[PDB]
Amino acid sequence: AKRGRKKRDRKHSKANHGKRPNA
Amino acid sequence: MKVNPSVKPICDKCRVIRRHGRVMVICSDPRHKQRQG
Amino acid sequence: MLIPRKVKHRKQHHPEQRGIASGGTSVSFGDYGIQALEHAYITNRQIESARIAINRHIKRGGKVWINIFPDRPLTKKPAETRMGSGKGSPEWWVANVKPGRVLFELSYPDEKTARDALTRAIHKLPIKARIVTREE
Amino acid sequence: MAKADKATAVADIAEQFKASTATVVTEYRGLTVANLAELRRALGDSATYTVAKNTLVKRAASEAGIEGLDELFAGPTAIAFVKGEAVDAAKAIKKFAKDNKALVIKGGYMDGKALSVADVEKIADL
Amino acid sequence: LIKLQIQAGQANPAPPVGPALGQHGVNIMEFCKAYNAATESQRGNVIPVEITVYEDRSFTFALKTPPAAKLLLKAAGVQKGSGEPHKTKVAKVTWDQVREIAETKKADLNANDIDAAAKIIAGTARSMGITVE
Amino acid sequence: TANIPNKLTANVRTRTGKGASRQARRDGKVPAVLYGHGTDPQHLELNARDFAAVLRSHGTNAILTLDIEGTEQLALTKALDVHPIRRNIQHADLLVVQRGEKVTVEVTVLVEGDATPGTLVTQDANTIEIEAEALSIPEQLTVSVEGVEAGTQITAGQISLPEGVNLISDPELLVVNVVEAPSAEALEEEGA
RNA sequence: GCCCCUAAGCGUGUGCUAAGUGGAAAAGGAUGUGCAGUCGCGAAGACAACCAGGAGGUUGGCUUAGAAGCAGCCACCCUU
Ligand SMILES: [Mg+2]
Ligand SMILES: [Mg+2]
Ligand SMILES: [Mg+2]
Ligand SMILES: [Mg+2]
Ligand SMILES: [Mg+2]
Ligand SMILES: [Mg+2]
Ligand SMILES: [Mg+2]
Ligand SMILES: [Mg+2]
Ligand SMILES: [Mg+2]
Ligand SMILES: [Mg+2]
Ligand SMILES: [Mg+2]
Ligand SMILES: [Mg+2]
Ligand SMILES: [Mg+2]
Ligand SMILES: [Mg+2]
Ligand SMILES: [Mg+2]
Ligand SMILES: [Mg+2]
Ligand SMILES: [Mg+2]
Ligand SMILES: [Mg+2]
Ligand SMILES: [Zn+2]
Numbered sequence: 001a002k003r004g005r006k007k008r009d010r011k012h013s014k015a016n017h018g019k020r021p022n023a
Numbered sequence: 024m025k026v027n028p029s030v031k032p033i034c035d036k037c038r039v040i041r042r043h044g045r046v047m048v049i050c051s052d053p054r055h056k057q058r059q060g
Numbered sequence: 061m062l063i064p065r066k067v068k069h070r071k072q073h074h075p076e077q078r079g080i081a082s083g084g085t086s087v088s089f090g091d092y093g094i095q096a097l098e099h100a101y102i103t104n105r106q107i108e109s110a111r112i113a114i115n116r117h118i119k120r121g122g123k124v125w126i127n128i129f130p131d132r133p134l135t136k137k138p139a140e141t142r143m144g145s146g147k148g149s150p151e152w153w154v155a156n157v158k159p160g161r162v163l164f165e166l167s168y169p170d171e172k173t174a175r176d177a178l179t180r181a182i183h184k185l186p187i188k189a190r191i192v193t194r195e196e
Numbered sequence: 197m198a199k200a201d202k203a204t205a206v207a208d209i210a211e212q213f214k215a216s217t218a219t220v221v222t223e224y225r226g227l228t229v230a231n232l233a234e235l236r237r238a239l240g241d242s243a244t245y246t247v248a249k250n251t252l253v254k255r256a257a258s259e260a261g262i263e264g265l266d267e268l269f270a271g272p273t274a275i276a277f278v279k280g281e282a283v284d285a286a287k288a289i290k291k292f293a294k295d296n297k298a299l300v301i302k303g304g305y306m307d308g309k310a311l312s313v314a315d316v317e318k319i320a321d322l
Numbered sequence: 323l324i325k326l327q328i329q330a331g332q333a334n335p336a337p338p339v340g341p342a343l344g345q346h347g348v349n350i351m352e353f354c355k356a357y358n359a360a361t362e363s364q365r366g367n368v369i370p371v372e373i374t375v376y377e378d379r380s381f382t383f384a385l386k387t388p389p390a391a392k393l394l395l396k397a398a399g400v401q402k403g404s405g406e407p408h409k410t411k412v413a414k415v416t417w418d419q420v421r422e423i424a425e426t427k428k429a430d431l432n433a434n435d436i437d438a439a440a441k442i443i444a445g446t447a448r449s450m451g452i453t454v455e
Numbered sequence: 456t457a458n459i460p461n462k463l464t465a466n467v468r469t470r471t472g473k474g475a476s477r478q479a480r481r482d483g484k485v486p487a488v489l490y491g492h493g494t495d496p497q498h499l500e501l502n503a504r505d506f507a508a509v510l511r512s513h514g515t516n517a518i519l520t521l522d523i524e525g526t527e528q529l530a531l532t533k534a535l536d537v538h539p540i541r542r543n544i545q546h547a548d549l550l551v552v553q554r555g556e557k558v559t560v561e562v563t564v565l566v567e568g569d570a571t572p573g574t575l576v577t578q579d580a581n582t583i584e585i586e587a588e589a590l591s592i593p594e595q596l597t598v599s600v601e602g603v604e605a606g607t608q609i610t611a612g613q614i615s616l617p618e619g620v621n622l623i624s625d626p627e628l629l630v631v632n633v634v635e636a637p638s639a640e641a642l643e644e645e646g647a
Numbered sequence: 648g649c650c651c652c653u654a655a656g657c658g659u660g661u662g663c664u665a666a667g668u669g670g671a672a673a674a675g676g677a678u679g680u681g682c683a684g685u686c687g688c689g690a691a692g693a694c695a696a697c698c699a700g701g702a703g704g705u706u707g708g709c710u711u712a713g714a715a716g717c718a719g720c721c722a723c724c725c726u727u
Contacts, residue, residue: 407708
């Protein structure tokens with residue numbers, strides 16, 4: 001589950017403003 | 024030497040201390056000796 | 061096991077988690093009480109376990125009030141079933157719990173054992189909870 | 197124990213002292229409660245035996261001219277008041293000390309004066 | 323340096339005293355015969371006995387007054403004390419028996435006066451759940 | 456039974472709203488509205504900490520003297536808004552009262568003593584409502600339970616009151632109920 | 648975004664963090680530390696440390712092999 005966790009966690013970047021495509 | 028996420032002073036003689044960043048319980052009774060691991 | 065005698069509709073939408081409690085936010089029957097801090101469905105069997113814990117710790121005296129009743133049902137489909145073909149059968153009953161709700165009330169003579177029994181109760185619940193009293 | 201209780205104890209000690217012809221200050225370290233009960237049995241008929249705090253008596257000693265007894269309050273303090281006569285408690289304490297050997301006579305107060313061990317021993321012979 | 327409670331007219335019971343007196347260096351037969359003579363002189367109540375030992379295995383027995391428990395039980399007429407004191411009252415005691423036991427305990431206790439021993443006996447009956455009148 | 460008014464300072468609210476209310480709460484102040492028979496409502500803000508200390512000292516029904524820009528006003532704490540979670544005081548409703556005036560007030564009831572050991576004591580009413588003079592309201596009302604045997608009901612008629620206070624609620628209000636202590640097995644069927 | 652890779656601040660002022668926390672996570676456990684606020688005691692000497700005491704009734708009853716302050720139960724007092 002590390003891969004999905006890491007993607008959904010880099011969601012929280014300063015530049016992405018808390019949203020990314022595909023969550 | 025209990026190794027548990029939860030450590031408590033089982034009897035009144037037990038002391039709770041910290042050694043090298045780990046929470047430990049030390050007591051005269053060897054059963055009660057335990058650490059947070 | 062608390063189960064309602066009958067419900068008008070046996071298949072219902074999930075109780076909504078939004079907001080905080082408006083009613084039942086203060087202790088009213090007993091001296092001490094358990095106040096919720098998290099949103100959750102609390103099942104009847106969790107209530108049973110917590111009630112038994114309080115009873116065992118308190119033993120004879122005192123009285124216990126349960127302000128929460130599991131009348132909302134939740135359904136599940138049978139195992140290893142593909143998506144579709146209608147809603148499943150209901151097989152556990154829950155109560156919608158919002159922060160500020162007072163779940164349990166206890167009336168016992170002494171402070172220490174009352175607090176201890178309530179704590180034993182909270183350790184059986186899926187939520188953060190705290191202990192409150194009658195006084196403001 | 198509250199400070200109001202300390203004031204009440206000071207007042208009670210002063211009141212007891214005003215009605216006492218003499219007093220004896222002694223050391224009791226090393227005495228069981230059975231020994232103290234025996235001492236009360238002997239003294240309780242006529243005299244009075246008490247033990248009180250050093251500074252509480254010190255403040256209770258500021259009433260009359262017994263303020264010079266403060267130097268006798270370094271160490272354990274046992275007070276003996278003589279409600280009946282003046283010297284029965286003197287012999288009682290002396291015999292109790294001789295029998296038990298754990299009692300030390302710090303001093304006495306009589307006739308407005310504080311007297312030492314040999315002086316009190318001489319006075320008891322009177 | 324021990325103390326036990328033993329029946330007046332009976333000697334050498336196995337559970338209470340035998341092994342208790344065996345490991346304290348006390349001769350048992352002489353103690354039993356002297357105690358039997360003394361408590362047949364008394365003949366009235368079971369008694370507590372205090373044993374003081376010396377370095378030459380010499381034993382001295384001190385016989386106190388009959389216990390306040392047994393004295394109150396025999397003065398009240400009942401055999402066993404109340405299982406629920408202050409809830410179930412099984413007997414009633416008047417002040418005359420209280421003052422007799424108070425005199426006995428004055429012979430026993432450190433109380434300065436008879437009234438103090440009477441209050442002690444009243445408290446003992448309170449532990450027995452027996453009314454004192 | 457005479458109570459001295461408690462001195463608190465009040466500031467007329469320049470702006471009213473929810474934004475203003477939240478800002479004032481953030482600034483350690485509590486908003487309030489003063490209204491009464493004078494038919495003249497005023498929107499005020501108070502120091503939260505002083506107000507809370509006053510309530511701790513003299514209960515939820517405390518007589519207050521308020522300094523509105525040098526003007527002294529007598530008021531009563533008619534209503535409070537306490538957050539269920541944070542347990543702050545979000546808003547206060549203060550009632551204008553003059554000396555020698557009769558008002559209806561809910562006074563809490565507390566119990567003390569020791570009943571029969573085989574009994575359990577339950578309180579059914581937290582407070583009872585009473586007609587009383589504005590400056591003569593009681594801080595609290597007490598009921599003593601001792602030697603109370605088995606099932607005994609204490610009602611609002613039986614509660615003792617100070618002089619000059621009249622009880623309004625019907626005396627049938629069961630305040631305190633003393634019941635036989637539940638047995639060990641008695642706890643297993645309730646809630647099952 | 649601004650130490651170097653890599654354009655532009657090893658910017659200024661006041662605090663916090665010792666975990667490389669920053670640079671993944673729960674119920675729960677815990678004398679980590681900073682700030683703010685209550686209550687208790689305390690020079691009329693507080694807490695720790697410390698020398699000496701902590702007795703008599705009496706082994707309070709019921710319960711038992713046993714009940715002695717220390718299975719349990721119920722009461723839970725007096726004297727110095
Ligand atoms: Mg997983
Ligand atoms: Mg999504
Ligand atoms: Mg565990
Ligand atoms: Mg909706
Ligand atoms: Mg509602
Ligand atoms: Mg409600
Ligand atoms: Mg929990
Ligand atoms: Mg590159
Ligand atoms: Mg550059
Ligand atoms: Mg910057
Ligand atoms: Mg720099
Ligand atoms: Mg910098
Ligand atoms: Mg800096
Ligand atoms: Mg990291
Ligand atoms: Mg974490
Ligand atoms: Mg926790
Ligand atoms: Mg902290
Ligand atoms: Mg037993
Ligand atoms: Zn231990």
